[model samples]
Target chain A: PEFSKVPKEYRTAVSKAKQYASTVHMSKEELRSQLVSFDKYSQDASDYAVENSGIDYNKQALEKAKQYQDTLSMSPDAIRDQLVSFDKFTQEEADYAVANLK
Target chain B: KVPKEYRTAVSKAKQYASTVHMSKEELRSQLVSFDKYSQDASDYAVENSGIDYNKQALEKAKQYQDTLSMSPDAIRDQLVSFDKFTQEEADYAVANLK
Candidate 1:
């Protein structure tokens, strides 16, 4: 956990990643891409934060699926589409989500 | 095409209307609190959700009567003040509770 010369931008990106991961329930790619596009983080900085955040993407995907069901009243099929197409969870993660869904 | 965020908020609005019978104001606040929906998106969803406020108020009133055994005055008060239903809607709801 000691980066001798970790740039301020990298540290900031990590902070953003942690916040997004906890508050928004983003998939791994979704978080990484958001860091780059939304936050204008450099590719390396984005990757550094996403990879080092220690987030469990599968659980994130499950929670995302639950939100769609609870808040949106989406069907399982619709939830799957949202999870993969726009929400950006992987097929395996999404499958786990729907299979364990409420 | 509208942004996907708007569409998503619309779905959430409809769901809240259908399930919890929340007033429009409550529904919009819920969208913001839960999904971090933008104010613009919440406004768009509430305006376009096709929810009937009178019906939602009635349903909510019925629940308060059945579950909490509230009188008409209390039901009306909660509907208008706490649940954020309009005065007319609250009156209509109190007029009919099955």
Candidate 2:
């Protein structure tokens, strides 16, 4: 909300980042990966998005676990790897998701 | 096509680009970052490797989307912004990924 010092390019990036966070339940690392991938924004922008995204990574991990289980029929190990490797979830979070999967 | 040394560099670059899924800049940097090849050599390798950067961009977009659950716009931004892909290339990636 207080982006007075942030550049316009980064502002736009953060705005989109917020949308992704709210709609898709993206993880912080996932958001940072996308934010840093943009050539227009700097590390500052990415860091800003990471700080402001207001994500609950544990919840996102659970969502991803359900998605993989329902759609891919993946094993727990596979789900954990997908979450860690692709979704940027920490090992702890991945383990949590795997353990919590029904 | 320039010389044998460059041909070898191109071969390695191709391996990194195709096998490991490295971006153009990443490929170039890998070639030069370790002081394994001169910038000129790396540049030539990339130019002549005949790698389809656009296709690679699309592949990356799909990976992030399907694997990481990134949004379409976020994937586009990654390709164009971080991966050094052109906007057109990024657009092509997202459009053809489905």
Candidate 3:
């Protein structure tokens, strides 16, 4: 990744995305949503970061499922919806999370 | 000239403030939640909405007191925490409320 060659906004988005990924465990879509919603990055820049972020969406889905189950006691169906609708996980990835939940 | 997003956000802000009586920070957070508008757009909306935040604070204070039977101190904290009213504005509302 040529950080210096990219536009400042793209660089910033990638940097922020990494921070969120490492600490907050955001899915790619969730990360992109925050980036744009908070006006931290333009939609295009957020998209770029999401595409290149190297984040594992499956792992994020698992983390989110654990959090929901431990705190909210959410049903599997509700958890799947939250993953797909809010976190922007693919149905397949969400299914993987539910299937593997302990 | 204001951008289209800015204008759109301002119109939405006016409606949210008039109907919901949301505090400025809450309104901004709602607008930003859409993920299509920028914080800049939300700021523009709040600045142009023409609603008095102090008055909104008072309305929220009364609602909490009446509905939740909350103490004055509790209402003030709710105003600051959930409604995004500043401590000073919450104090003002508590002081002025009956």
Candidate 4:
């Protein structure tokens, strides 16, 4: 009912964040940055959208790690580090992700 | 980083590739139809769809056999006709059906 105060950018940002999460599997930080850098969404809108976007960071980290492990031929340690260093996943999340790489 | 232009179509292609069993031609046509994707965008979407036609045909074959109780020949015809699978792919699917 209260849609007046919302910027149109917020609407699309939230929608795009969910789309990116499902298809490309970006971490929250990565998603926000993508919205900002590529989609030209304002930082505040990106932050708000990501904060409200429905996603499990652990799942995102795991899927991304699996993608690298299978596609890029990355080792377990490399996957973990990539999840953490580049993907901005937490250390515990990365650890959880690498252990299940099949 | 799909350049934003073809991203939606590409994503739709990938979704269809995973969620539905359709030939590459059928998928492209759907994208070009109500989805309103341009021919180039539709082509690019299917080309980059990461679909394995053989696998899709095989899945459809199994679905028809299990659900429709169709014979292998009938299924092959349907696959090649309505589903738009290639002759080779349909043959492979019918041959592999149990």
Query: For this target, which candidate reaches the highest TM-score against the unseen true structure?
Result: 1
Which residue pairs show collisions in model 4?
A: none
How close is every model to the real structure, measured as TM-score? 0.51, 0.49, 0.48, 0.49
Q: For candidate 1, write residues A1-102 as lDDT tens digits.
A: 455588889889988888877766778877877787667799899988888877889999998787666545578888888788766789988998999875
Model 1 per-residue lDDT at B75: 95
Better of 1 and 2 by TM-score: 1
Please give the range of 10 consecutive residues that has the lowest summed lDDT in model 3 chain A: A64-73
Clashing pairs in model 3? none
* Residues B1-98, model 3: lDDT tens digits: 98988888888877766645677777776677543478799888888868789888887676556433467998898788656788888999999877
Q: Look at candidate 2 and give me any clashing residue pairs.
A: A37-B82, A38-B81, A39-B81
Docking class of 3: incorrect
Per-residue lDDT of A1 in model 1: 46
Stretches of model 4 off by over 4 angstroms after superposition: A1-5, B1-98
Docking class of 2: incorrect
**TM-score for model 2?**
0.49
Candidate order (lDDT):
1, 4, 3, 2
Tens-place lDDT per residue, model 4, B17-94, is: 675566888777777754678888888887786788998899777756643456899999988976778999999999
Candidate 2 lDDT by residue in tens digits, B9-61: 98888875664455677667667754378788899987789998887787778
Q: Against the true structure, whose DockQ is highest?
A: 2
Give model 3's clash tally: 0
Query: TM-score of chain B only, all predictions?
Result: 0.93, 0.88, 0.85, 0.87
Per-residue lDDT of model 1, residues B1-98, tens digit only: 99999998888888778766878777776687566899899989988978899999998787566434468898999888767789999999999864
